[PDB]
A and B are shown apart, each in its own frame.
Chain A
Amino acid sequence: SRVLRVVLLGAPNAGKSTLSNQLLGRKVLGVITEKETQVILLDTPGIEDPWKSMESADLVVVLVDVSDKWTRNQLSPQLLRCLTKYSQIPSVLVMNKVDCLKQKSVLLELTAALTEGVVNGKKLKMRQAFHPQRIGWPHFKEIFMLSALSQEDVKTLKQYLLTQAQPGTPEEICANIIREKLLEHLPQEVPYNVQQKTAVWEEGPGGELVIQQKLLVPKESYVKLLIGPKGHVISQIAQEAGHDLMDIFLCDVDIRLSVKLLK
């Protein structure tokens, strides 16, 4: 039996949660068991929790968003401190959201900047033209270039991680799905200010799951945004939410969404 504790570090919106979900194969600490290997992924908040996770880490996966022009050119100082104090733990660089890059050859230069020209103890000599606060981390064991959103080559990282292993409520679910749909469809802060209240949850005469959920908001403009033109917006949400539920509980579900102002 082989086990590997891997901790995900990086910027807030570097996609750590997305990559963890893709590795797990489900949108959810996570455990990936395959044959005789067990990989424990520890998702940490973006930059006390990351350091405490490092205290029990066998491998570190440093995610960098290449699409973000502001932060792609350097590793954040706190991340560099984290790696320096735990230099003994192996670290692997993952350049996420490559699909968003228009000119992807840029990646190459970024590597030289992020790895300081050294990877896995070997220098990255590169044909050289015609003749202090650290910016990178020269002790990365390996480099990956992937896009977690499209699952592009996440399988390669999964197989790599498997290789480095060393011998050794339903109402809540429905609320989470509705929250996801609200986030996807509603603008700005509105989906963060919607309170949900389960009104009816029962089994109908035909074996279906009859759900009536109430969407409470503090403002009338939020009600208008929720209902949308001619009731389209809310309607769309319900159907999509219902469709997701079709796959989660494996039955027929009649979900009805009603919007009321918080008094």
Chain B
Amino acid sequence: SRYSPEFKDPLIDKEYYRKPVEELTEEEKYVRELKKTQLIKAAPAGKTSSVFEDPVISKFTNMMMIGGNKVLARSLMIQTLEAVKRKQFEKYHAASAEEQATIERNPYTIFHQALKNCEPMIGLVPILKGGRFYQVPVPLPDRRRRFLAMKWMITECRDKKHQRTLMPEKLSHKLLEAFHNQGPVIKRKHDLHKMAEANRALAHYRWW
């Protein structure tokens, strides 16, 4: 790394700095005084103080990236969000007065809930001894399950069975399916939850 160990990561949150001195605890006050001394790294291209910033969508865009082509990945992401918005407006305009109160049109709410519906709770970790790798059920950490939801969505949208259907349209359809607890990604979550219940023999190894 070109940065020394001294350099610390920056904090881009904009409302943190405006917190009044009165609300500061002695511990938070000490941390604020300590950051005064430290060297801080330059903020990387990416996250900003903008109010439309969304870390989850940024990570999804980075996971769709191929060959460092960030312009194309962000273009695909915004096309997907626009497509979800337009499809929900289409469904809302054709819906009855009493079905309009339950149609979500915010594409960000749909994206977040769709990814949340695809997160697994349990997974399997192989462990090595005796020459035989042993598959033990494990409760997945929050980071791991958030990553797996995104990876499953992107792999599902990269399947070659979707011939000439463009990625924004495939991804919007998959997101709207997962928003309603349907589709192949929810089934992939279920098939891991069942294949972890089929192997509860080694269910109590707590030291993966």
Contacts and interface: CB of A to CB of B under 8 A. Distances in A.
Interface of A: 104-109, 111, 115, 119-120, 122, 124, 126-130, 142-146, 153, 156
A126 B127 contact: no
A111 B132 contact: no
Interface stretch (B7-15, B62-70, B194-202): B194-202
14 contacts: A108-B130, A108-B134, A108-B136, A111-B202, A119-B201, A120-B200, A122-B201, A124-B199, A127-B135, A128-B132, A142-B200, A143-B201, A143-B204, A144-B204
B19 interface: no
B129 to A, nearest CB: 4
A177 to B, nearest CB: 34
A89 B129 CA distance: 33
Contacts of A120: 200-201
Contacts of B199: 122, 124
Chain B interface extent, by class = 20 to 34
Chain B facing A: main interface SS: loop
Contacts of B206: 153
Ranked 3 nearest A-B pairs via Cβ: A119-B201, A127-B133, A105-B129
Contacts of B203: 142-143
Interface string B94-116: 00000000000000000000000
Contacts of B134: 108, 126-127
B126 interface: yes
Nearest to B128: A105
Given A105-B129, A109-B129, A127-B132, A122 B202 contact: no
Interface string B121-152: 00000111111111110000000000000000
A113 B136 CA distance: 17
B203 to A, nearest CB: 7
B17 interface: no
Nearest to B126: A127
Given A142-B200, A146-B204, 18 more contacts: A105-B127, A105-B129, A106-B129, A108-B129, A108-B134, A108-B202, A108-B205, A119-B201, A122-B201, A124-B202, A126-B133, A126-B135, A127-B132, A129-B132, A142-B203, A143-B202, A143-B204, A153-B206
Interface of B: 126-136, 198-207
Contact of B201 (A106, A115, A127, A153): A115
Nearest to B203: A143
A104 to B, nearest CB: 6
Contacts of A122: 198-199, 201
Contacts of A115: 201
A126 B203 CA distance: 14
A104 B202 CA distance: 13
A129 B206 CA distance: 24
Contacts of A127: 126, 132-135
A72 to B, nearest CB: 15
Contacts of B128: 105
Contacts of A130: 131
Nearest to A119: B201
